[PDB]
Amino acid sequence: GVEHYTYEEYAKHIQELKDYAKDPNAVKDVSQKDLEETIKKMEQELEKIKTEGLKIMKPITIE
Amino acid sequence: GVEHYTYEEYAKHIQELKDYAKDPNAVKDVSQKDLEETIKKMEQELEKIKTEGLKIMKPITI
């Protein structure tokens, strides 16, 4: 199986990204509007995990 | 911070995962078959970086 997020894990990931976007010293390779748009898209995907069983591939770490 | 992978960076990340899968005595909560299936899905996403401009966000850090 492809490693994928749980609703709880993805909700936490989204909150970490929301908190980071508000850090005055946040480093981003996209505009503030693009990041807010991406967070909106992730919130729609989060609800699809609950309502459609959407499998959002989870990153794998090597350590 | 918020950064997206380049094709080269993601290709390197996939190779580092392939190298990891070769020492089964790994320290992760992923089975060998789930790791192989996950790497297959990542190879499809790698091609989308080149053919569709897919933006894959890197883990958020420092």
Automatic annotation (TrEMBL), chain A:
It comes from the Bacteria. This is Uncharacterized protein. It comes from Clostridioides difficile (strain 630) (Peptoclostridium difficile).
